[PDB]
Write a protein that binds this ligand. Structure first.
Ligand SMILES: COc1cccc2c(=O)[nH]c(-c3ccc(Cl)cc3)cc12
Ligand SMILES: [Zn+2]
Length: 208
């Protein structure tokens, strides 16, 4: 039941999603090993993901969380990078999209930094890179990220350098505690707590 609607670049919605993508790029502590070397992206396409069943699944769970947290869903817009983008947009998030080995346990991981999610497009640690050239820093091959609506509810704060949420909590927040430029990362343990709202097609750009 999924349909994808192209946004025109003249559309304010295209422009505000592109700006969130571009403005949350940072340098990474691997020097670009996992995700490539770049300071900005070439945005090729932005599509709205429309699936009524998956949306109602999201809003149902959002209401449950909100009612457990003084009518506050604590909803964010966050990036997700994955080799399974194309299954996610058709079937929704579930246990098969969890990062089993993540530092906050087996859950589904999201980032404020678009460049963090970019490290996972070709797999954990960037895998072996693009399928065509085996290059984690490929400037040619098209990449895709999701920009997702995520319900955090009461989030457990972890200060730092499928499983269950900590008791009394609906998510985990990974707060950066060394790299002063890093933005937060978040983990949910229920696939229903996220909706893949935008599919973004891009390339990383080689710095001049
Ligand atoms: C530190 O983890 C993360 C931190 C921040 C963001 C992400 C992210 O966007 N995706 C992923 C990810 C996706 C698919 C698999 Cl199979 C594994 C991991 C991780 C991840
Ligand atoms: Zn390539």
């Amino acid at each position: 039941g999924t349909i994808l609607i192209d946004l025109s670049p003249d559309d304010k919605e295209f422009q505000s999603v592109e700006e969130e993508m571009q403005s949350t790029v940072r340098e990474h502590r691997d020097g670009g090993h996992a995700g490539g070397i770049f300071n900005r992206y070439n945005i090729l396409k932005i599509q709205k993901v429309c699936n009524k069943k998956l949306w109602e699944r999201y809003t149902h769970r959002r209401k449950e969380v909100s009612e457990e947290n003084h009518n506050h869903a604590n909803e964010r817009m966050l990036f997700h990078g994955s080799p399974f983008v194309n299954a996610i947009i058709h079937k929704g998030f579930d246990e098969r999209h969890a990062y089993i080995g993540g530092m906050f346990g087996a859950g589904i991981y999201f980032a404020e930094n678009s460049s963090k999610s970019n490290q996972y497009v070709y797999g954990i640690g960037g895998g072996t890179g693009c399928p065509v050239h085996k290059d984690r820093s490929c400037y040619i091959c098209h990449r895709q990220l999701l920009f997702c609506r995520v319900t955090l509810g009461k989030s457990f704060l972890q200060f730092s350098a499928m499983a269950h949420s900590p008791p009394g909590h609906h998510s985990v927040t990974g707060r950066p505690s060394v790299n002063g430029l890093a933005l937060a990362e978040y983990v949910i343990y229920r696939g229903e707590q996220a909706y893949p709202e935008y599919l973004i097609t891009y390339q990383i750009m080689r710095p001049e």
